[PDB]
Amino acid sequence: MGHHHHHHSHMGSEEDDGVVAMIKELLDTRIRPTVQEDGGDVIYKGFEDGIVQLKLQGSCTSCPSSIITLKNGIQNMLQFYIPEVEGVEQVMDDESD
């Protein structure tokens, strides 16, 4: 790339990486397996302003009811351990569109 080499922000060491990291495992252990059995998956996009941003894959995102049910299930699970989670947001993050 060009002679810039400057980052305004950085992942890994994020806003409260303690919360961020335990969300990653709460997905990978509890949520991701369940969604994958239905024929989808959840990709952790981040945690910002108390909003856990997740990319939803097919089957789950294909049916509008399944979007709401999945988002709410993940939300309530995360809120139980982490009261910092006020919300969860479905972000279709894929630059092919």
- Check the annotation: does 60 bind a ligand: yes
Residue 8 lies in a domain: no
Residue 96 lies in a domain: no
What is residue 21's DSSP assignment? H
Q: What is the domain count for the chain?
A: 1
State the Cα torsion 72-78-83-86 to the nearest 10°.
-40
d(Cα 42, Cα 53) in Å, to the nearest integer? 10
- Check the annotation: does 82 bind a ligand: no
Pinpoint the alpha helices (H) of the chain.
Answer: 17-26, 32-38, 64-81
Provide, for the chain, the percentages of residues in helix, strand and coil under a 3-state DSSP scheme, each rounded to the nearest 5.
40, 20, 40
What's the domain range around 68?
A: 17-91
